Amino acid sequence: PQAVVVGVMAGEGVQIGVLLDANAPVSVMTDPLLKVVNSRLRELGEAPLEATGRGRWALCLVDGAPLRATQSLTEQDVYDGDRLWIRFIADTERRSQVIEHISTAVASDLSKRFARIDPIVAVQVGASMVATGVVLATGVLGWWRWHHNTWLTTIYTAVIGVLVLAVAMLLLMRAKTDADRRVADIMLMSAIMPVTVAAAAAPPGPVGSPQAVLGFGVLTVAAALALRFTGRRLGIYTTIVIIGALTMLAALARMVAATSAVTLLSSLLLICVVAYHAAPALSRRLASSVRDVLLQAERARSFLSGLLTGLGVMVVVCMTSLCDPHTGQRWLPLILAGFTSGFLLLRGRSYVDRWQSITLAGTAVIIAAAVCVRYALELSSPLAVSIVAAILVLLPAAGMAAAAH
Amino acid sequence: KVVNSRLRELGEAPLEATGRGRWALCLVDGAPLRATQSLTEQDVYDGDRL
C-alpha cells in the first residue's frame, strides 16, 4: 500500500508507466516527475517539454482536471493501473475593462456573448420550410384520394416528386462542405414522401388493401436505394426500411387472405421479438490502418440505434391494437403486455450505449401508458378514469423513485 | 540510521519491512540509483528530492 503504479502522459503523447509514492502530496512529485519524462524523451531523441511565458506545471487526470496540490495520492480516488497527465496551464491574470455609458455598454457586451443570423443559416432555414411545405400539400392531396377516385392525386403528386428530386439531385453533385450536404439531405429526405403516395394512389377503386401494398413497397425500395447511393443519414433511412418492409408483408397477406387482424398483429409481434434478439448481429453484418477501426464502430452504432427504434414503433402499434377492454378474455392481452414490458425493461439495460438503452427503456413506458389510456377512454366510468389516473401517475413516479432512492 | 533516529524524535515509526531484499535510494518513479557511482556522476544537485 506504500506505492501505486500508474501511466503518466507527457508532451505530444508518450505514455510512461511509473510507480508513485501513495501518500506524499502530489505537489511534491510534479517537479522531479517533469525531469524524468524529459530525460526519457531526450534519450528517445524527442523534443522535451517547455514553458511558454507565464504559467505553471500541474498533474491532471486524463480529463484535464487538475488534482488538488495539497492532497495525498491515496486521499484522491487514484488506484493502481490508472493514468494521469502532466500539463502546462497558462496565467489568466489581466486588467479589467469598464464602460460606464449604458447604451454603448449594452451593445458591446451583448455582441460578444451571442450569435447573429448569417447567410449559412438562412439557407438551412429555407430548406426546412420547403420540406415542411410539400408534406402539407401531399397531405391534402391524399385526403382527397381517400374520398375520391380520380387520377388527380397521382398526376399532381408525381410532378412534385420529380421536381423536388431533380433539385436535390443537382445539389448533391455540387455540394462541397457539410453545410452544403445538410441542405441537400433535407431536400432529398422530402422527395420520398410524395412518390410514396403517388404510387399508392394509382390503383383504381376504393382505397384499401391493394393500394397500400404499392406505397410500402416503393417506400422500402426508395429509402434503401437512397441510403445505398448516399451513404449518410443511416438512422432515419434504416428505420423507414424496417417499418416499410414489415408492413408490406402484412399488407400482402391481408390483400391475399387473412382470417383476422389478431393473427397478423401476433405474427408481427413474434417477428419483432426474434428481431430484438438478433439486432446486434444484424448490425454487425450490415456494417492509415487505424481508420478502418473508427469508421466501422460508428457505422454499426448507427444501424443498431435505428433498428432498435423501428422495432419499438412496430410493437407499440401492434400491442395497442392487440389489447382491448371489451373483447374476450380481457386479462389475456393485459398480462401479455406485462410480460412484453418486463422483457424490454430487463433487456434494455444490457446494451452499452445511452441512446440505445434510453430509447429501449422509454419504449416500455409508452406501451404501458397507452393501455391505461385505452382502458379509460373506452369502458368509461368515474371509477375507471379515477383508477387509471392513479395508475398512470404512480407508474412513472415509482420508476423514478426506484432510481432516485 | 539518521533517518530512523530523526523519525523517532518526530514521533514517527522508523523505516521497517519484511522479506528478502534491501534498502536503497529511489527516484519519484521508483527507479533506484546506481550503487557504485558518485552522486556527481548521477544527475543530483542541491535541492533535489529522493
Binding site: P25, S27, D31, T70 | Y45, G47, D48, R49
Partner: peptide, 18 residues
C-alpha cells in the same frame, strides 16, 4: 504563499549559482 510553496520555490532556486 504557504510554507510548502515557499520551500518548493526555495528548493528550485537553491539549484543555481553565479
Amino acid at each position: 504563499v504557504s510554507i510548502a510553496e515557499a520551500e518548493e520555490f526555495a528548493q528550485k532556486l537553491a539549484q543555481w549559482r553565479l
